[PDB]
Amino acid sequence: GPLGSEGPVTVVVAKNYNEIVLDDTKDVLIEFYAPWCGHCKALAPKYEELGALYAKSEFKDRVVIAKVDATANDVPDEIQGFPTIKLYPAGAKGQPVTYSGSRTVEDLIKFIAENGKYKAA
């Protein structure tokens, strides 16, 4: 099946992230998690749900839910806890927005609306 070809699930590698995140034309949300994390294993499935929901909404060309593991190369991302969330707003990018702690997609969407201009006003 698609499993991403539709848009919800998107790949973000060291050689790609720089592009999507730097893209001011559209907003991008790259989340760093791990399978063996234990507390992040849920972040994966939780991202797949919000991805298909937000993707179906009327913001396909406004915000894109991108997932990625925090075990890649050329990725200078120092964080306290694995469940790290990097916010990159379209137009006001250039600064990696590091969250304080994940738990539910509901908190992610809300925040993006407070920090992201595309999901605000």
How close are the terminal C-alpha atoms of the chain, in Å? 36
Q: How many domains are contained in the chain?
A: 1
User: Residue 47 corresponds to which tokens in the numbers above?
Assistant: 């991202």
Q: For residue 60, give its domain range.
A: 1-121
Other beta carbons less than 10 A from residue 45's beta carbon: 8
Experimental approach was NMR
**Catalytic-role residue among 20, 28, 40, 105:** 40
Give the SS3 label for residue 106: helix
2 is catalytic: no
**Catalytic-role residue among 13, 37, 52, 75:** 37
Give the SS3 label for residue 88: strand
Q: Residue 47, class by beta-carbon neighbours within 10 Å (0-12 exposed, 13-18 middle, 19+ buried)?
A: buried
Instruction: Quote the CA–CA distance of 81 and 31 in Å, as a whole number.
Output: 12
CATH number of the domain enclosing 32 = 3.40.30.10
37 is catalytic: yes
